[PDB]
């Protein structure tokens, strides 16, 4: 009940859940889904499979407001980022294109133990 035909799809995924959301042909939000968005607790949210379940339903809804043509945005590395975005092209949906962003800083913000060990 919004209908658009085209825009962009955003894929963001950690290594402990993934998320995907429709964005108009600019950047403002549409509708989405993710790990627990798909009955998946603790882990699971962290599977290529999930990657998919979501990517997919995501599109479905994406269609709801007449959407099909989409270019795609990339954030991080999702452990299944592929079962995912692939699931994405598969639900047909004008699988227009993809772009590379996963925007790392320039080196000016120490992390938490887990990310240090750098150098």
Partner 1 sequence: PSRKAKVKATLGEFDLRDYRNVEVLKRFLSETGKILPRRRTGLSGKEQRILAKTIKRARILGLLPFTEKLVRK
Partner RNA sequence: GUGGGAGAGGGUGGUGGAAUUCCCGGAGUAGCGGUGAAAUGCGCAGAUACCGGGAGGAACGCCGAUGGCGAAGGCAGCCACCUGGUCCACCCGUGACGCUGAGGCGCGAAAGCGUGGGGAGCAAACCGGAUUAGAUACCCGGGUAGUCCACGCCCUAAACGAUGCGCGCUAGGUCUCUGGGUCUCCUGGGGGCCGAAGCUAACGCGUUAAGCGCGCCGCCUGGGGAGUACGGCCGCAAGGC
**Residues at the site binding partner 1, with contacts judged by CB under 8 A:** 74, 97-101
Does residue 97 bind RNA (CB under 7 A)?
no
Return the structure tokens found at 113: 């133990």
Does residue 117 bind RNA (CB under 7 A)?
no
CB of 53 closer than 8 Å to CB of 47: no
Q: Which does 19 bind (CB under 5 to 8 A by kind): RNA, partner 1, none?
A: RNA
Q: Report d(CA 91, CA 83) in Å as an integer.
A: 12
Q: Report d(CA 70, CA 38) in Å as an integer.
A: 22
Give me the residues that bind RNA (CB under 7 A), please. 2, 10, 12, 14-17, 19, 21, 23-24, 26-32, 34-37, 41-43, 45-46, 73, 75, 103-114
């Amino acid at each position: 009940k919004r209908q658009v035909a085209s825009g962009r799809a955003y894929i963001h995924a950690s290594y402990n859940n993934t998320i995907v959301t429709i964005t108009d042909p600019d950047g403002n939000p549409i509708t989405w889904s993710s790990g627990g968005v798909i009955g998946y607790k603790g882990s699971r949210k962290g599977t290529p499979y999930a990657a998919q379940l979501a990517a997919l339903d995501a599109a479905k809804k994406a269609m709801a407001y007449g959407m099909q043509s989409v270019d795609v945005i990339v954030r991080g590395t999702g452990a299944g980022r592929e079962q995912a975005i692939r699931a994405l092209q598969a639900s047909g949906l004008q699988v227009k294109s993809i772009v590379d962003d996963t925007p790392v800083p320039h080196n000016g913000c120490r992390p938490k133990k887990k990310f240090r060990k750098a150098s």
